[PDB]
Structure 1
């Protein structure tokens, strides 16, 4: 089991960490969602589906910088929504193919009433998402840590 980003940054068997740089809608109004869909930038696969089933969760998601201060967050994982920053590990998604499958994580971030102006700074860390991989074969319990950075400013109109 291993993962890679859209630009080819890899985290190999056994886990590790990587940086993911995301383009963000440049203007987001109070009452609207800023959507950060990581399923277009993070992909994983099972290296031995003949014998092993891999299990993959969002173990935790943490907010940083302007996302922590200026947004009210929800994370959608494989079709279900939960609070973000997260309050529990999600259910498991099965990985059972050698063909890359997206990691089905999306953040939905809506501005808090106090938000206004440059609510997310370009280049800043906005989230850390911990992907936890286990299986039905051995005791493997690995963390794939995704540090998510904004590529651009996000302005909340006032």
Structure 2
């Protein structure tokens, strides 16, 4: 099982920066949408649904904006964010990269700085054969631009 960010090199585990464009203007009360399907994709390293991968997002995933409320959309369910439970499982068995069905909804001068981590999303992988060779990924979401209020 592997992933990449913006079509880059393969990632098997660990922490990776994910850079996102945010609305530069936000008014008190507005809602920011971060569509991570535009950046993070994952695939099965054998294909053919031979040793299917099972991935979910993990309890504790949170803003970094620590006081913000929000929602996290993952694979047909919208969870309160920060995550207080593990999400449903997405199964990945094709070698073709699958953009992750993942969106973050954020409700808050400069409020978000370019280059600062605004959320840490922990993803867990376990496959089917043997032990499933479980792996941990963390996606550190980073804004490419300032967001001002």
Q: Same fold (TM over 0.5)?
A: yes
Asked if 1:132 is matched to 2:124, the reply is yes
Structure 1, gaps ≥5 residues long:
112-116
Shift of residue 138, structure 1, vs aligned partner: 2.1
Where 2:86 maps in the other structure, the secondary structure is coil
Corresponding residue number in structure 1 for 2:8? 8
Q: What TM-score does the superposition give when structure 2 sets the normalisation length?
A: 0.90
Corresponding residue number in structure 2 for 1:78? 75
Q: What TM-score does the superposition give when structure 1 sets the normalisation length?
A: 0.86
Where 1:39 maps in the other structure, the secondary structure is helix
Corresponding residue number in structure 2 for 1:53? 52
Structure 2, gaps ≥5 residues long:
none
Distance change >3 Å, CA 33–CA 9, structure 1 → 2: farther
Shift of residue 119, structure 1, vs aligned partner: 1.4
Matches within 5 A, 1:1-158: 1-12=1-12, 15-50=13-48, 51-60=50-59, 61-64=61-64, 67-69=65-67, 71-111=68-108, 117-139=109-131, 140-156=133-149
Aligned pair count reads 146
Shift of residue 145, structure 1, vs aligned partner: 1.4
